[PDB]
Design a protein around this ligand. Structure first.
Ligand code: HEM
Ligand SMILES: CC(C)[C@@H]1NC(=O)[C@H](Cc2c[nH]c3ccccc23)NC1=O
Ligand SMILES: CC(C)[C@@H]1NC(=O)[C@H](Cc2c[nH]c3ccccc23)NC1=O
Length: 394
């Protein structure tokens, strides 16, 4: 119909041209319809409007997560007949800040050493390789697997890691699998944690699931909900983003040569990667809890307004030459971690692993993509973009 269906099927790093067109339209908020549900939605693509949306106390993230809310995802991101309200259930137990606490600056100071050791071990192994090697399978996968075990869930076996990763990939999708396969992915996840979360939380370590369990005691359902939250929020984001960041670096050898010569510039390159490299193929979303206007557009209570972080991060009103990867950039704050109350509580740990990845690349001149960027294959339909492989050579 004449109402755009959402999302825009831009599964590779090439952002859908529709975002820029909506950004330059006369409307600061554009009505769309969810392809997966037919629900009406509003879409924001301008930085200035997105700031207003994500800092407005009348827009509720949790209300947009509730069952029956208009939504972009085809299947609800909860197990059948469960609350799907992990952050609120943690706060109910009196754990208001455990996620930020276990992922903040002190946690980076605990984990940054081994994270950098491992990035270096993995890249040193690749430096010994002949011919073409795969940066997704042989760098991103082992690094993100270690991140998950050591910081989020506890020591997982290869089979457990494989199962949770498959559940995330299958459930967090707009298309490419059946409805039944999507629901089953969340089931295997929830039933996995109902059985194993107590065991995982009880093993020695600093992992977040232990911190949650060991801080009326927490029920197995709340602890299982916490496990599924950590998988959904932590696994496909880290693997998708690290893959995409590697692609960005390989496509910008001049920038990498600068980082090789001036390693103190790496933190700024991390921030530019967070702005430039696209991640989600949908939008962050909030529900209006009362009638309001945003930039003149009237929104009724109950309606859901979305912001594409990719669109905002590429807004020329905010970032001059927004489609240029410019590590020296000194523009406004990027939206890669969101904005306001729900700003990514994993942001410091994520920055730590991105930095370690950038340094591992910058230290080794000659690394290059083995084929043209347009020949990279992409997992079609994931919420969190990820290439199937990153073939590279020296
Ligand atoms: C490069 C990696 C990552 C990126 C780009 C990223 C990005 C984001 C963004 C944009 C949001 C805001 C969503 C919204 O406003 O609705 C968010 C929220 C969140 N992130 Fe991250 N994230 C990353 C890694 C992680 C990791 C490793 C964890 C560990 C569990 C994590 C945990 C969370 C949680 C729990 C939330 C929900 C906060 C809330 O809704 O209040 N993230 N993330
Ligand atoms: C299920 C939780 C993640 C929960 N559900 C949400 O919709 C929001 C936003 C969010 C952050 N990271 C995600 C990854 C996949 C899908 C959604 C999200 N925050 C939550 O804590
Ligand atoms: C149904 C999907 C759109 C799903 N629903 C969400 O609420 C989050 C929001 C989000 C946008 N960018 C991100 C980056 C990292 C973590 C979360 C997000 N993303 C999704 O893909």
């Amino acid at each position: 119909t004449a109402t755009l269906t959402y999302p825009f099927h831009d599964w590779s790093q090439e952002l859908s041209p529709r975002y820029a067109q909506l950004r330059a339209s006369d409307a600061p908020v554009c009505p769309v319809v969810s392809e997966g549900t037919g629900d009406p939605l509003w879409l924001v693509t301008r930085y200035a409007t997105a700031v207003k949306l994500l800092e407005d106390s009348r827009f509720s993230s949790e209300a947009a997560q509730a069952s029956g809310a208009p939504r972009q995802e085809p299947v609800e991101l909860r197990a059948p007949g469960t609350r799907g309200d992990a952050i609120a259930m943690l706060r109910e137990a009196g754990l208001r800040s455990v996620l930020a606490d276990g992922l903040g600056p002190r946690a980076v100071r605990r984990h940054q050493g081994w994270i950098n050791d491992l990035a270096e071990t993995l890249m040193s192994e690749l430096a010994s390789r002949e011919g073409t090697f795969d940066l997704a399978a042989d760098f991103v996968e082992p690094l993100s697997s270690a991140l998950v075990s050591r910081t989020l869930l506890g020591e997982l076996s290869a089979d457990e890691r494989d199962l949770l990763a498959h559940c995330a990939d299958t459930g967090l999708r707009f298309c490419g699998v059946t409805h039944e396969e999507q629901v089953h992915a969340f089931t295997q996840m929830h039933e996995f944690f109902l059985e194993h979360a107590r065991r995982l939380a009880g093993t020695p370590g600093e992992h977040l699931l232990k911190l949650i369990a060991e801080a009326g005691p927490l029920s197995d359902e709340a602890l299982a909900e916490a496990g599924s939250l950590l998988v959904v929020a932590g696994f496909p984001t880290s693997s998708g983003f690290l893959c995409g960041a590697l692609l960005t670096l390989l496509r910008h050898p001049d920038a990498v040569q600068e980082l090789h010569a001036h390693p103190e510039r790496v933190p700024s390159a991390v921030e530019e990667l967070l702005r430039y490299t696209p991640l989600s193929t949908g939008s962050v979303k909030r529900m209006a809890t009362e009638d309001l206007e945003i930039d003149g557009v009237r929104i009724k209570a109950g309606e859901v307004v979305m912001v594409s972080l990719e669109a905002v991060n590429h807004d020329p009103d905010a970032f001059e030459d927004p489609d240029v990867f410019r590590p020296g950039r000194e523009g406004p704050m990027h939206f890669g971690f969101g904005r306001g109350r729900h700003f990514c509580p994993g942001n410091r740990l994520a920055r730590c692993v991105i930095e370690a990845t950038v340094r591992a690349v910058a230290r080794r001149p000659g690394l290059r993509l083995a084929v043209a960027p347009e020949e990279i294959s992409w997992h079609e339909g994931l919420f969190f973009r990820r290439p199937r492989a990153i073939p590279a050579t020296w």
